[PDB]
Amino acid sequence: KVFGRCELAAAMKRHGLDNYRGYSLGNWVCAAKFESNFNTQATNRNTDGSTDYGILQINSRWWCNDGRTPGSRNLCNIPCSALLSSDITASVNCAKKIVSDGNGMNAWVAWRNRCKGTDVQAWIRGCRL
Ligand SMILES: [Cl-]
Ligand SMILES: [Cl-]
Ligand SMILES: [Cl-]
Ligand SMILES: [Cl-]
Ligand SMILES: [Cl-]
Ligand code: NA
């Protein structure tokens, strides 16, 4: 599923991401835009053999099991394929664990390089929330 901007903002708000660990909703929409272009089915392989999955490009090196990342962890206790669903529940719940692990949203490289320090409120401007 390719979400619209305001559609995704509303879904993330319903799932409790607005101001989660102090990160306003616009931060999460901005991260999703540049990680996946709002596409739940996005995948990308990393140099070390791990793979990033879904709307927030969560990495099989630490967070999910895809059966092909030897020596990795599965800290969200899910198969990585669950992060590609049109229902974003699994991605949101795993992202909550990630952002709580000490480094905040700096875990998302695209957030750090393209959202951090910008006017992220623009990403939810005009949306009915
Ligand atoms: Cl957009
Ligand atoms: Cl915001
Ligand atoms: Cl594995
Ligand atoms: Cl949902
Ligand atoms: Cl933080
Ligand atoms: Na893994």
Enumerate the β-bridge partners of residue 44. Answer: 52
- Gap from CA of 21 to ligand 5 centroid (Å): 7
Tell me, yes or no, if 52 is annotated catalytic: yes
Distant-in-sequence contacts of 6-9, Cβ < 8 A, 24+ apart: 6/124, 6/126, 6/127, 6/128, 6/129, 8/32, 8/38, 8/55, 8/88, 9/123, 9/124, 9/127, 9/129
Ligand 6 centroid–CA 63 distance in Å is 6
What is the CATH architecture assignment of 5-124?
Orthogonal Bundle (1.10)
Q: Tell me if 82 sits within 8 A of 95, measured CB to CB.
A: no
48 in a labelled binding site: no
Ligand in closest contact with the CA of 121: 2
| 59 three-state secondary structure | strand
Q: Which two tokens stand for residue 107?
A: 């875990």
Q: Where are the domains of the chain?
A: 5-124
Resolution (A): 1.6
Query: Which residues are placed with Cβ below 5 angstroms of ligand 5, an ion?
Result: 104
Method for structure elucidation: X-ray
Say whether 35 is catalytic: yes
